[PDB]
Amino acid sequence: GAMNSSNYAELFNNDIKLFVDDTNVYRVTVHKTFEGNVATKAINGCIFTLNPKTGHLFLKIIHTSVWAGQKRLSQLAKWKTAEEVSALVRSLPKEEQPKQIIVTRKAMLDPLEVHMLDFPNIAIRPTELRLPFSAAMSIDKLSDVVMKATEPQMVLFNIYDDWLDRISSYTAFSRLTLLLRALKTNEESAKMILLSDPTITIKSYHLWPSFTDEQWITIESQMRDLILTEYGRKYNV
Amino acid sequence: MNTVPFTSAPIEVTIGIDQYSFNVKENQPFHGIKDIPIGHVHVIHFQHADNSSMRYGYWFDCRMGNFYIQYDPKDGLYKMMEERDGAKFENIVHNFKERQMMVSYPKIDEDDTWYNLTEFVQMDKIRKIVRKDENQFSYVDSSMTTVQENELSDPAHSLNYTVINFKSREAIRPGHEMEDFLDKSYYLNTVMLQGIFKNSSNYFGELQFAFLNAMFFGNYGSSLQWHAMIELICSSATVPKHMLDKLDEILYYQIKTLPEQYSDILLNERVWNICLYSSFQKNSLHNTEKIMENKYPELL
Numbered sequence A: 001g002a003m004n005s006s007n008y009a010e011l012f013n014n015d016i017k018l019f020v021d022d023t024n025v026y027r028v029t030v031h032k033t034f035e036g037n038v039a040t041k042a043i044n045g046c047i048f049t050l051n052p053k054t055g056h057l058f059l060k061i062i063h064t065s066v067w068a069g070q071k072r073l074s075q076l077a078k079w080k081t082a083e084e085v086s087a088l089v090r091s092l093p094k095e096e097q098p099k100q101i102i103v104t105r106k107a108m109l110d111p112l113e114v115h116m117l118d119f120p121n122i123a124i125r126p127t128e129l130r131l132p133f134s135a136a137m138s139i140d141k142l143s144d145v146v147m148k149a150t151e152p153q154m155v156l157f158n159i160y161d162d163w164l165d166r167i168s169s170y171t172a173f174s175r176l177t178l179l180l181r182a183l184k185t186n187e188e189s190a191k192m193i194l195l196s197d198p199t200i201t202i203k204s205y206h207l208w209p210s211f212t213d214e215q216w217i218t219i220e221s222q223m224r225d226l227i228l229t230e231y232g233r234k235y236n237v
Numbered sequence B: 001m002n003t004v005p006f007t008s009a010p011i012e013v014t015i016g017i018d019q020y021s022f023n024v025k026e027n028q029p030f031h032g033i034k035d036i037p038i039g040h041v042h043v044i045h046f047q048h049a050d051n052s053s054m055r056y057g058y059w060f061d062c063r064m065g066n067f068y069i070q071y072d073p074k075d076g077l078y079k080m081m082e083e084r085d086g087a088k089f090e091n092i093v094h095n096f097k098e099r100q101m102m103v104s105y106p107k108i109d110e111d112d113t114w115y116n117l118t119e120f121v122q123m124d125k126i127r128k129i130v131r132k133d134e135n136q137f138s139y140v141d142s143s144m145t146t147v148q149e150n151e152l153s154d155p156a157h158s159l160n161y162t163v164i165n166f167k168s169r170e171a172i173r174p175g176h177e178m179e180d181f182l183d184k185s186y187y188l189n190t191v192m193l194q195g196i197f198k199n200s201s202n203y204f205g206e207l208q209f210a211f212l213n214a215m216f217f218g219n220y221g222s223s224l225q226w227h228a229m230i231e232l233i234c235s236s237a238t239v240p241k242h243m244l245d246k247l248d249e250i251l252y253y254q255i256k257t258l259p260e261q262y263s264d265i266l267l268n269e270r271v272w273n274i275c276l277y278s279s280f281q282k283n284s285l286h287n288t289e290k291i292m293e294n295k296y297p298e299l300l
């Protein structure tokens, strides 16, 4: 059934699984028209499909042309997500196909189940975890590839950089979710933490800075402070 | 007007005949039911006084044979049987009528209720859902499971209702996933009406047969089937106008006949609220919506 704090280590076992987050698929700016009405303008989006054990990220870029002439876009976006995830699964060799797909929002369950009828043995699961994957577009290299896209495109990344050489998947996921939670709660501050220091480069082939083990401890502490702080500035505590 | 003669009534029992019912005391001189209208299927059903568990009964059509009830003390139930000797049977019956040992099917002349509940129900079609090929009548009880229930255990004792499953390859054309799930017209009109059922008379008949088994026996799988068949029509944007008009009449008489005190268990809140207020056909069931709103506004 649902994925929560109790069965949390299941994410790091040897059964292939993917999280799917659809938050950033349909993105708009809201603006005034010449007549003083309100209209939306779509901007490019992305499906965030992540293997939490290996860090492999399948970033399917959703170009605004997919919305042209379509109605009820927020509903369509869920079905388009499910269509693209199904197409990704079919494209993978059998031994790489997931045994479970965990959707971050329960409204993805029926669209994905329907698109995966041909795969009765792949479990489609919700989660009670409040995961911060919406903040993926605060990672500069991911935002850049999405905004520059002129056509539908899939781009592959490892969201853990080389961290798995030194830490376990559990610890790598914990770091990722801490970074993304910080970026979601106060993007400007989080990005200042990550990059204020101009002596730590981000490698061309990486997403995050090249911190030593000790520097990661300081970084992680600084992100925890930020999250608690903002939780202060928010609730006045 | 036909008759169903009883050898006797050895155990106290409430006997239903269609929408009517009456109590018979242990060893009371009861010898059956006369004046049964020809032209419709009928159901004769039983609930024992000592064990209200297991309502059970028999669907039959007197045009197909001479049928009588005799209690079996070994299996502990009232059994329907066919007598093949037409003359012995006419004789036992005329005798019981002369002794006035029978209840009369108590139909009011103005009243079309049973016709309206059984318009597309016939004995031959009933046997395609409930199987015992050696008898012309069909036994149903409260506990019998449906073929679909058995997929999610005795096959011979099952109601073969056509499996309806909205998240199934049968319901969903490859490449039309969103379209077919949000608008079930292709599943309704092509798969079910043109392919399996063959016409709306057959679809309406299974829908009606499902309701009556739910109402008379508390058969849970039949209730599921009735609601699934309603939901499949209501969730289709393209339905022939005559089917919508007939469905409104069918459901109206079903809601009208339902015991007020069984609405809680026999009516699915989600399906009815979806069908009456959210579906493509939210505005096409005027008679059903009016009776539901005036009789069961709590559910909604």
Ligand SMILES: CCNS(=O)(=O)Cc1ccc(F)cc1
Binding pocket: B005, B006, B007, B068, B083, B088, B089, B092, B093
């Ligand atoms: C008891 C056996 N009799 S019988 O064989 O003539 C069939 C029959 C039985 C009971 C009836 F009320 C009517 C017909």
Ligand SMILES: CCNS(=O)(=O)Cc1ccc(F)cc1
Binding pocket: B120, B121, B122, B125, B126, B128, B129, B162, B196, B197, B201, B202, B203, B204, B205, B206, B209
């Ligand atoms: C595919 C099976 N169709 S059917 O025509 O037997 C449905 C039906 C069943 C029972 C009835 F009393 C009337 C109709």
